[PDB]
Amino acid sequence: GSFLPNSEQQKSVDIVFSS
Amino acid sequence: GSFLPNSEQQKSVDIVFSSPQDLTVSLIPVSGLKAGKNAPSAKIAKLVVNSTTLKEFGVRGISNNVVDSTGTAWRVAGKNTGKEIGVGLSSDSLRRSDSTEKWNGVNWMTFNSNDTLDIVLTGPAQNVTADTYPITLDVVGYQP
Amino acid sequence: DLTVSLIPVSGLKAGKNAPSAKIAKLVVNSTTLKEFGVRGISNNVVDSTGTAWRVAGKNTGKEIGVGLSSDSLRRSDSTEKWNGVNWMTFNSNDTLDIVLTGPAQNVTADTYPITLDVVGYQP
């Protein structure tokens, strides 16, 4: 049993509110 | 006693520990978001995580202000205004976890690789100033 | 002569595994020989009888400790010497367990080979 740091992954996006 | 040299044999077999390996990830901003008073739990992004050789994916929000013990709710600042909004996994998404795991102590909520999850404006209705708000998530393979 | 079967346990899992988890069953049968000796064969044998050794992930290149289980070791008839080399002996027509030696080994998600040498012994 465990976590796989081997496949840890980071992701970023921009959320846009218009007005 | 004696050993029988002519009876000596070598035998070999393979042992396999499996299948946890890898995943792919995608984070899609929701179209048509409008400044001002928003609906409670308004959807703002869709998270996709995909894989064959894994199943329980873990996810946490990453920011300068994470507000719960699993990192599934946090606050983010607008680029142009610096105003903060509360974001996190939707209540429906939270209820679809596979587990609540403690990476050597650090908590993560876990989800089936291949599911989509919703990121929403958390809490009661928020009044959101027009701006661009960055969101960052960390995703990881969990394995029982 | 001897008839030898070495049977992998199926569905094993990665990361923290049980201390001493069973990983293979050794089956040695004979109509003629009362006993056999057995040693693990690898690039890193770790005790004087060759009943504990290390092996590694074929794809990831990382190690695991393997060997006869403590129960299996306690079934030995004796430890004998063949021109000075120790071989633990066991009754033929028996099975023995090969296990993950040591603590909850963090087994990496891979395939691992095991090789044993088995020899007939007449007491």
Q: Which of B78, B52, B50 is closest to B64 using CA atoms?
A: B78
CB contact under 8 A, A10 and B133: no
Q: What is the dihedral of CA B76, B79, B83, B87, to 10 degrees?
A: -20
| Domain spanning C3-121, CATH architecture | Sandwich (2.60)
CA within 13 Å, CB half, B88: 22
Burial of C68 (0-12, 13-18, 19+ CB in 10 A): buried
Measure the CA–CA gap between A2 and C107, rounded to whole angstroms.
Answer: 10
Instruction: Report the C-alpha dihedral over residues B113, B114, B116, B117, rounded to 10 degrees.
Output: -10
Q: Do residues C87 and C119 touch, judged by C-beta distance below 8 A?
A: yes
Q: How far is C75 from chain B (nearest CA, A)?
A: 19
What distance in Å separates the CA atoms of residue B12 and residue C80, rounded to the nearest whole number? 24
Alpha-carbon distances, residue C105 vs A18, B6, C55 (angstroms): 53, 37, 13
Contact B116, B24 (CB under 8 A): no
CA quadruple B106, B111, B116, B118: dihedral sign = negative
CA distance B18 to C8: 13
Residue B94 host element (H or E) = helix B91-95
Q: From the list B11, B18, B21, which residue is nearest C116 (CB)?
A: B11
In whole angstroms, what is the distance from residue B97 CA to residue B64 CA?
A: 25
Q: Which residues between 30 and 89 in chain B have a beta carbon less than 8 angstroms from any beta carbon of chain A? A: 30, 33-36, 44-45, 54, 58, 62, 76, 79
Q: Which CATH number fits domain B27-127+134-141: 3.30.700.30, 2.60.40.1570, 1.10.3720.10, 3.30.43.10?
A: 2.60.40.1570
* Cα separation, C1 vs B42, whole angstroms: 75
E-only strand ranges, chain C = 3-8, 15-16, 22-29, 35-41, 52-56, 63-68, 78-82, 85-91, 94-100, 106-107, 111-122
What is the resolution in angstroms? 17.0
For the beta carbon of residue B137, count every other beta carbon within 10 angstroms.
24
Query: What residue spans of chain C are helical by DSSP H?
Result: 70-74
Rounded distance between C-alpha atoms, residue C42 and residue B134, angstroms = 53
| Residue B100 token pair | 């609540």
CB atoms within 10 A of CB C31: 9
Burial class from Cβ neighbours inside 10 Å (0-12, 13-18, 19+) for residue C97 reads buried
Contacts of C16 in chain A (CB under 8 A): 1-2
Cross-chain Cβ contact C106/A4 below 8 Å: no
Q: Token pair for residue C22?
A: 């069973």
Which stretches of B17-130 are assigned E, i.e. beta strand?
24-29, 36-37, 43-50, 56-62, 73-77, 84-89, 99-103, 106-112, 116-121, 127-128
C-alpha span between B78 and B20 (Å, rounded): 38
Pairing of the two strands B24-29 and B43-50: antiparallel
> Where are chain C's structural domains?
3-121
**Distance between CA C60 and CA C23 in Å, rounded?**
19
**A18/B137 CB distance under 8 A:** no
What distances in angstroms separate CA C44 from CA B33, C41, C56, C60, one per listed residue? 62, 8, 10, 17
Length of chain A (residues): 19
Name the DSSP letter for residue B20: -
